Amino acid sequence: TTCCPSIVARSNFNVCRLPGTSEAICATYTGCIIIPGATCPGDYAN
């Protein structure tokens, strides 16, 4: 599951994913994170 720190970061993550880029590369590029669970924390609410 991906969790993003702001709405900007989420929007940038979604563009990064359009060509098929790995989630892990899009995470370091945007500041979003990948967790094994389904419950994003409050500081990664977007």
Author numbering: 1 to 46
What does the paper say about this structure?
Crambin is a small hydro­phobic storage protein of 46 residues (4.7 kDa) found in the embryonic tissue (cotyledons and hypocotyledons) of seeds from Crambe abyssinica, a relative of mustard and canola, commonly known as Abyssinian cabbage. Six cysteines are paired into three di­sulfide bridges, and together with five proline residues endow the protein fold with extraordinary structural stability.
As part of an ongoing effort to describe a macromolecule at true atomic resolution, we report here the structure of crambin at 0.70 Å, which is the highest-resolution protein structure determined at RT to date, with data and model quality approaching those of small-molecule crystals. The structure was determined with synchrotron radiation using 31 keV (0.40 Å) X-rays and refined with independent spherical-atom approximation to an R factor of 0.0591 using SHELXL, resulting in the best refined macromolecular structure at RT to date. The structure shows only minimal radiation damage as indicated by analysis of the electron density near the three di­sulfide bridges present in the structure. While there is crystal-to-crystal variation in the relative amount of the two different isoforms, the structure presented here, determined from a single crystal, refines to approximately 64.2 (16)% SI form and 35.8 (8)% PL form. In the final model, 14 residues of the total 46 were modeled with more than one conformation, with conformational variability primarily involving side-chain rotamers. The most prominent patterns that can be discerned in this network are water pentagons, formed at the hydro­phobic interface between several symmetry-related protein molecules. Dynamic solvent networks resulting from alternative side-chain conformations and shifts in water positions are revealed, demonstrating that polypeptide flexibility and formation of clathrate-type structures at hydro­phobic surfaces are the key features endowing crambin crystals with extraordinary diffraction power.
